[PDB]
Design a protein around this ligand. Structure first.
Ligand SMILES: CC(=O)c1cccc(NC(=O)N2CCOCC2)c1
Ligand SMILES: [Cl-]
Ligand SMILES: [Cl-]
Ligand SMILES: [Cl-]
Ligand SMILES: [Cl-]
Ligand SMILES: [Cl-]
Ligand SMILES: [Mg+2]
Length: 346
């Protein structure tokens, strides 16, 4: 067991191992500090969870987040450097701290203020798809891909973070908000049981915005955003209408005048024809017909970067806990076992 020290930073007690020095608040599900890790030489983010075991819902969310971060071991995905508690037994266990690499800029800080060549767009979207091939091979859905959840460095190297932990509220998705502009229509309006294809819709929206410098579907509300989507990709045919489970959602769609799919070369003026072709394969209304991450990596747009011997898959991931009914203290015991069994990376 390391030695811990205590300090108060902006109204909060932080109790952390001596290896972490020069803590400074960066923001606030919990509170975050920047620190220097003397064991590894890296600058790190230390997150102190708020009220991790306050309800059955909160205790299960804490377990879910720790299981997911412990599993993810890939160059294009956020990984866990450390996890700790100052508790010496289950009986006094009440606080959880998570440690990752400190991230600088996000995709927003380069798409707003920088000139991107087609080669930059190839390399950035290649890396998102390499990370997604890995995540989807474990049967994990990210559910919240958008520019603010993608970290980028000076060498244009990218990491996926901030997985959807079943978090977002109704207030958070209302009106003129970037939290909804990247979501697939079937999850935005609860059409059907969704699956991993929702993440490929989000990659299409991101790729379009890197090419044009503008949000693809900046709706003022759910209905405005659906009208922008259907004007580009066309209204649904009878085959997709059959797959929408809500009768009211089917009746609403049938109230709209029919529209054909637009010509994407006339929308993405001057783009690489291979970029236009890949966008037409991602931005498909019927989720069964969208290109997968593994199929997209082999598309001719990425010929410069694609290496089928350097695009790894994940170890199998057991999510059977998701259907399990437990008490607060049972979820808290499972979480304690995962904290004490952690093995750091090389
Ligand atoms: C490289 C690339 O594809 C690119 C670059 C800048 C802008 C656009 N397209 C638009 O801003 N449009 C055109 C017509 O529709 C409304 C506005 C495309
Ligand atoms: Cl230490
Ligand atoms: Cl990482
Ligand atoms: Cl504790
Ligand atoms: Cl964003
Ligand atoms: Cl597992
Ligand atoms: Mg985020």
């Amino acid at each position: 067991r390391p030695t811990f020290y205590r300090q108060e930073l902006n109204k909060t007690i932080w109790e952390v191992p001596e290896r972490y020095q020069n803590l400074s608040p960066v923001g606030s599900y919990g509170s975050v500090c920047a620190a220097f890790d003397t064991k590894t030489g890296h600058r790190v983010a230390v997150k102190k969870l708020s009220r991790p075991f306050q309800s059955i819902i909160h205790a299960k969310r804490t377990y879910r987040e720790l299981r997911l971060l412990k599993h993810m071991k890939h160059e294009n995905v956020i990984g866990l450097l450390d996890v700790f508690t100052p508790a010496r037994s289950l009986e006094e266990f009440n606080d959880v701290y998570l440690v990752t690499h400190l991230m600088g800029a996000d995709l927003n800080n380069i798409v707003k203020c920088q000139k991107l060549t087609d080669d930059h767009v190839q390399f950035l979207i290649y890396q998102i798809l390499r990370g997604l091939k890995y995540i989807h091979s474990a049967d994990i859905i990210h559910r919240d891909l958008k520019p603010s959840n993608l970290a980028v460095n000076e060498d244009c190297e990218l990491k996926i973070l901030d997985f959807g932990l079943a978090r977002h509220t109704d207030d958070e998705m209302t009106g003129y908000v970037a939290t909804r502009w990247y979501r697939a229509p079937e999850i935005m309006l609860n059409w059907m049981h969704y699956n991993q294809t929702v993440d490929i819709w989000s990659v299409g929206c991101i790729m379009a915005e890197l090419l044009t410098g503008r949000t693809l579907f900046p709706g003022t509300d759910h209905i405005d955003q659906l009208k922008l989507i259907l004007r580009l990709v066309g209204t649904p045919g009878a085959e997709l209408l059959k797959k929408i489970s809500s009768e009211s959602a089917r009746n609403y769609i049938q109230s709209l005048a029919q529209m054909p799919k637009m010509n994407f070369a006339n929308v993405f003026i001057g783009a690489n024809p291979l970029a236009v072709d890949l966008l037409e394969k991602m931005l498909v209304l019927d989720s069964d017909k969208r290109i997968t991450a593994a199929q997209a990596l082999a598309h001719a747009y990425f010929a410069q970067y694609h290496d089928p011997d350097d695009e790894p898959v994940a170890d199998p991931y057991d999510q059977s806990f998701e259907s399990r009914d437990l008490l607060i203290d049972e979820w808290k015991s499972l979480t304690y076992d995962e904290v004490i069994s952690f093995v750091p990376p090389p």
